[PDB]
Write a protein that binds this ligand. Structure first.
Ligand SMILES: Cc1cc2nc3c(=O)[nH]c(=O)nc-3n(C[C@H](O)[C@H](O)[C@H](O)COP(=O)(O)OP(=O)(O)OC[C@H]3O[C@@H](n4cnc5c(N)ncnc54)[C@H](O)[C@@H]3O)c2cc1C
Ligand SMILES: Cc1cc2nc3c(=O)[nH]c(=O)nc-3n(C[C@H](O)[C@H](O)[C@H](O)COP(=O)(O)OP(=O)(O)OC[C@H]3O[C@@H](n4cnc5c(N)ncnc54)[C@H](O)[C@@H]3O)c2cc1C
Ligand SMILES: Cc1cc2nc3c(=O)[nH]c(=O)nc-3n(C[C@H](O)[C@H](O)[C@H](O)COP(=O)(O)OP(=O)(O)OC[C@H]3O[C@@H](n4cnc5c(N)ncnc54)[C@H](O)[C@@H]3O)c2cc1C
Ligand SMILES: Cc1cc2nc3c(=O)[nH]c(=O)nc-3n(C[C@H](O)[C@H](O)[C@H](O)COP(=O)(O)OP(=O)(O)OC[C@H]3O[C@@H](n4cnc5c(N)ncnc54)[C@H](O)[C@@H]3O)c2cc1C
Lengths: 532, 532
């Protein structure tokens, strides 16, 4: 069953996550070999600073990645693929992202939500034969969903009308901010088909060379400069019947690769840059690493990385937890980069090329890292919006008919007896007790709100409270997995894991308290008067 | 006396800030005229997007600013200056920053810490005659203090050794990240003179064309692209005796212009961009401005702007409050820009030129605003470092001998009777009661820490606690001034002020609670093990 699903009804399932899993040693060594090959390739052909300054990937890179099976990492030998586990794909994207995020994002889309991953789901027919033929030949793909109207719209205004002769459909509409679009051979397009008065969302496998399809825009953002990203108009684009697809777990697990892997990569580089800077600097004769606040900030960044690692390992060694991984990964990644900017200060704010030009010891592209990491709280959904959707669509669903374990909620039941054998420190066992108590409190809150509003549609109006509840659920999951991983790695002789776990749960402790304080607001201000 | 100084010893001096001052109407109308002239000039000659993309100001701008007295805004008619009040200079920089921050920063340095502002302090002699001659002719200046060693160092390693013939000094050392350096005619340089075994910090008025002075580096950062910023080597630069200066209120009040004015400008543009985006967008048939979370976020940004306005008006209509204005202004400015990025989402992350290229309705340079605003938590000191220095150098100084008002601290004395006549709402009067109680609690905390460590040097080791205390003092000042300004503007018929005040104090309420929770930490984790 599901740890986070149980957490929503106030159960702290230590037994589901302890002992914390670890990657198979043979599988990890297969990862090590493929990662070494990619690093050789991109370090030879890609200068990340030049890619950022020119906002362009070097000519020939996508080809060379294709020839070595890096755009078919999860496919079998049949397709000239590397047949990597999810854990090893994630590590491959992480490895790419630590050099150039644009390169990582191209690889992430293709190996996550492209026609390659989709192949296995398609039924036998012409479409499946075409995708296979393209994959053998080597293809680049993208998902074209977002419209100017907004991604958060339940409807898609891009229409698919059947042709008079019934052979295919005419696509009409606009797609915005589409990853890989400018280099894509084929796009997975979302469009509405009207069937006798009722609108229906359908997916279409559309060639980019289709007449009436126009890549009008090439999008450049604050970060990920060089990442192929395009907007397009469909003007009566003819799409044969077979090209119409005829689950969403592929999209959720895809976020681990597209969002969390690059977030971890950046968080790791930032920790590296923090340590190198602290090692080489001093204030008033005393080396910078001796000042308490500097020590705490290195600890907090190190603990954040450990937490991104925990959520990533739990997600890919094995559902709702993988949904929360998007926000936990992206936010922790952004925090580390923000913290690192404060630490490196003036040098941190300075561009890599500027520092390189003046022969600086540390030409670290931290400012690029901070601009890039911001993407991952936007791309794949806005953090507060995902926090809202998580609590209304996945937390109050268990309470609206009524909670099945309602007796447990009124009784304030907390199983402290199942946390007895851990291997955790006396402090990390205290963190574990408190998280289990907070789990039960979380459910009691959810019950009061559900009792307070009979209609969910009415409850769904109170967005701030539901966002905070989304956040609270993520904090407790992060604490739980961090303690589980700590117990495991400490058990296998990594004693630093206890300290890292201790730092993170202490911090989470303050964020949880803050979230409760905001939830406990009795009277709301007239924010509508203020907004005007 | 000083409101913030009294706040440090737990006194809430409502009587010192109520009624809140307002700018003289005649003075403000003089501001309106000068601001209109600057806007005409820069809107004609400066394209802010081009300045950002090329990281260069257009040729001739500094001249045209000089010819119209914008680099001598606070000087008298004698010098061809505009003789503006501090409040009007701040508004002039704000007006410039709302168009192009680089332009604002050049003007801010010259009108704050340049040779122009310094003129009045200099004693009669050749140096004063030279500065006057330069100011009449039109000059550009900068302060060269920061060295590769770090700005936070008490010592400066740049040396000034007297010449054998005793006519002047030889300057040797390196300065980093110097504003206006590449366009400066003269620089105010910090350097150490050794007098019979004891080091001494001295200021030198050095011409940039001095042989042995080399502008080796031209610094480009994440934001403020185009802002002239240079690093230099001094190789036995000869400086005549008269060129050696022979208080720091000029630097503190300068921060209002260099840090807070551009922070307010960005915060205001961001609120404007938020409202325009919300007005034009809808989700599921419902316009975006009808969703609670959207309403709250517009309210929180509007309330933040109001708070930056409050600290700015209190600082320039009239010391320690002006020190805290740096952090309050910069942080609130950064929060608004961060909040705005989440709101505008994909469009928000996209560059102005990208959105312009594809004929977007809103080619808003939000991403540029976010990159620029980050500067103001670094430039003029790192936010957490200023929070540390504020509590060790300006909060515990009143408690180390002992607190003069110790009786008040033990007695938990809170004057609720002086807050009776305000004009505030019943909610904003509650906010006022709570701030006065938090003021007293703040002093009781400070007493316990002072009692706990007999030696300040020992107390100064505990950096996290002292930073949090710095933060707590700033939050209560912000609440106090917001309520004071609200009472005044509501009294003069602006009823929205009550709502804006209410939004801000509610938010501050949560930040204060969070700060206390972190202060109340009983046992600390082993962060030194984690840092490694
Ligand atoms: C680098 C990058 C790459 C991308 N690549 C792709 C891609 O390959 N394919 C693709 O399809 N898309 C892609 N996107 C689009 C991205 O997923 C969207 O930008 C994002 O999911 C939503 O952005 P939007 O501008 O459409 O926001 P909207 O959905 O319009 O939201 C606008 C604002 O309103 C808020 N809001 C929305 N609904 C509510 C509500 N009910 N209550 C309160 N507030 C609400 C949102 O949180 C947001 O702050 C990419 C984006 C980026 C930045
Ligand atoms: C290669 C190609 C084949 C097409 N085949 C058809 C077709 O078989 N039937 C059809 O109705 N439209 C087809 N179209 C598109 C045709 O233009 C539409 O019928 C539509 O009516 C045009 O408007 C095709 C377009 C292309 C590029
Ligand atoms: C755009 C820009 C313009 C600038 N213009 C000028 C200018 O015109 N003139 C000028 O002189 N300078 C200028 N500066 C320099 C700027 O003021 C400094 O960068 C800043 O004050 C300190 O930066 P630093 O790199 O020297 O940091 P450092 O002082 O080396 O600090 C390094 C880190 O250590 C931390 N730290 C320091 N002391 C302690 C302590 N005791 N305990 C714990 N942690 C500590 C700091 O908070 C920081 O995080 C400019 C900077 C920028 C970004
Ligand atoms: C215009 C100018 C005037 C100088 N005048 C003197 C001087 O009067 N005395 C002096 O000792 N050095 C002077 N110097 C610098 C001289 O080089 C130093 O004496 C030093 O010893 C050089 O090393 C001067 C340099 C310049 C550029």
């Amino acid at each position: 069953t599901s740890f986070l699903e149980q957490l929503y009804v106030g159960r702290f399932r230590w037994d589901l996550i302890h002992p914390f899993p670890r990657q198979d040693e043979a599988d990890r060594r297969v990862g090590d070999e493929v990662i070494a090959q990619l690093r050789q390739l991109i370090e030879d052909r890609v200068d990340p600073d030049v890619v950022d300054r020119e906002a362009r990937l070097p000519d020939g890179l996508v080809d060379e990645l294709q020839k070595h099976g890096f755009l078919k990492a999860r496919l079998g030998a049949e397709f000239g693929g590397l047949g990597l586990s999810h854990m090893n794909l994630f590590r491959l994207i992480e490895a790419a992202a630590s050099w150039s995020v644009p390169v990582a994002l191209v690889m992430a889309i293709e190996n996550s939500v492209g026609v390659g991953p989709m192949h296995a789901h398609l039924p036998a027919g012409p479409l499946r034969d075409l995708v296979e033929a393209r994959l053998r030949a080597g293809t680049v793909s993208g998902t074209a969903d977002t419209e100017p109207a907004g991604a958060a719209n339940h409807r898609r205004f891009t229409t698919a009308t059947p042709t008079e002769d019934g052979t295919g459909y005419l696509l009409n509409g606009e797609k915005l901010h589409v990853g890989n679009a400018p280099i894509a051979e084929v796009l997975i397009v979302s469009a509405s088909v009207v069937e006798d008065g009722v609108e229906h969302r359908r997916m279409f496998i559309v060639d980019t060379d289709s007449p009436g399809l126009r890549i009008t825009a090439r999008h450049e953002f604050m970060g990920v400069k060089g990442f192929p990203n395009g907007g397009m108009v469909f003007d009566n684009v003819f799409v044969p019947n077979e090209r119409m697809v005829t689950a969403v777990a592929m999209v959720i697990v895809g976020r681990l690769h597209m969002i969390v892997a690059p977030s971890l990569a950046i968080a790791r580089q930032c920790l590296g840059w923090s340590r190198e800077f602290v090692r080489a600097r001093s204030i008033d004769g005393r080396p910078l690493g001796e000042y308490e606040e500097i020590q705490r900030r290195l600890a907090e960044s190190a603990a954040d990385v450990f937490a991104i690692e925990a959520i990533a390992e739990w997600s890919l060694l094995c559902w709702y937890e993988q949904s929360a991984a998007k926000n936990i990964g992206s936010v922790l990644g952004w925090r580390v980069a923000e913290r690192t900017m404060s630490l490196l200060a003036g040098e941190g704010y300075e561009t890599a090329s500027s520092k390189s030009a003046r022969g600086a010891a540390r030409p670290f592209p931290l400012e690029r890292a901070l601009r890039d990491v911001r993407n991952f709280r936007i791309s794949g959904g806005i953090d507060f919006q995902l926090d809202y959707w998580t609590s209304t669509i996945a937390i109050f669903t268990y309470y609206y008919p009524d909670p099945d374990n309602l007796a447990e909620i009124e009784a304030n039941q907390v199983d402290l007896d199942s946390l007895v054998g851990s291997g955790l420190s006396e402090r990390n066992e205290r963190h574990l007790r408190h998280a289990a108590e907070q789990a039960r409190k979380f459910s009691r809150l959810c019950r009061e709100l559900s009792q307070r509003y009979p209609d969910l549609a009415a409850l769904s109006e109170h967005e701030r409270k539901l966002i905070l509840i989304g956040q609270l659920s993520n904090e407790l999951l992060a604490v739980a997995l961090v303690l589980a991983r700590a117990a495991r790695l400490a058990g296998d002789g990594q004693d630093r894991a206890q300290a890292l776990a201790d730092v993170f749960c202490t911090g989470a402790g303050h964020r949880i308290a803050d979230i409760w304080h905001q939830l406990a607001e009795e009277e709301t201000p007239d924010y509508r008067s203020a907004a005007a």
